[PDB]
Amino acid sequence: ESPEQRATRLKRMSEYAAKRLSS
């Protein structure tokens, strides 16, 4: 569970949540 994996899943979930949230 390195810090890299955190940013990866975090970024994907973020960019997704953002794009999705907006419209």
DSSP codes joined into one string, the chain = --HHHHHHHHHHHHHHHHHHH--
| Token pair listed for 13 | 């979930």
- DSSP structure class, residue 1: -
Q: Give the method of determination.
A: NMR
User: Which amino acid is located at 4 in the chain?
Assistant: E
Residue whose structure tokens are 């899943």: 9
Q: What angle do CA 21, 10, 2 make, to 5 degrees?
A: 175
- What are residue 5's phi and psi, to 5 degrees? -55, -35
CA distance 18 to 10: 12
CA distance 12 to 4: 12
